[PDB]
Amino acid sequence: ALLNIFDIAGSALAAQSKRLNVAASNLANADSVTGPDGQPYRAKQVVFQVDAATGGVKVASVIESQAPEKLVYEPGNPLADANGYVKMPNVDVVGEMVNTMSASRSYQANIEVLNTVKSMMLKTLTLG
Amino acid sequence: LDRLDAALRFQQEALNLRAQRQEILAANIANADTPGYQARDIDFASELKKVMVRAVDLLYRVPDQPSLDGNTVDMDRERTQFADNSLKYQMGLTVLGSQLKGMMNVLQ
């Protein structure tokens, strides 16, 4: 089926957009010290899966990465624990700087796939 | 109705529904930045089946990812929708044209 390409590439576009938004949010919150209720910011990631044989890619869910918080010592802070160690986001920088580029490249590649498929479908539309 | 309109009523209604759906898609493209807007779309199959019995109701599109301003019109999903809608509109156009050309050629 050549119609399924549209909702395969749309799924790919949506998944890559979600991944790029997650990476941008992590980069923005790379240094945020607290949330709305004292909960430290946690790096988040998306889960990709196949639609199903094989099909498009769907984002199953968004999960906070389970890594120890890079806690720092600020005793004169209300959020400090009993030992004065406040918790900071466990977000690197190279990871997101590469995730953005990879997501953009995949997005552009799927755009090219959709363009080619649409062109050949329109050319098939005038058989004979 | 009549024996002639009986054959082409389905294709005419499909074309009209395609035009209305493309109009709604263009509307929610043009309102991509107005905050508090909700993307609208037509359940094409159900509406076509209902029309081919005898205005058109609007179904809100589920937001992809949240945004602060309240706008809920996506971009990639709606662009793919617009492209495929135009493609199927052209398909219906050429099918109806082929039917009419065959009918005319029979009468020569």
């Binding site: - | 508090g36 809100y60 599109r61 589920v62 309240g70």
Partner: peptide
């Protein structure tokens, strides 16, 4: 329910409070 589908119920407004009251 699934994103990208059609549902007759409009989505509730999105809000981003700075601090929980």
């Amino acid at each position: 329910g699934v994103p990208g589908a059609l549902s007759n119920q409009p989505a509730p407004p999105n809000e981003a409070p700075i601090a929980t009251p």
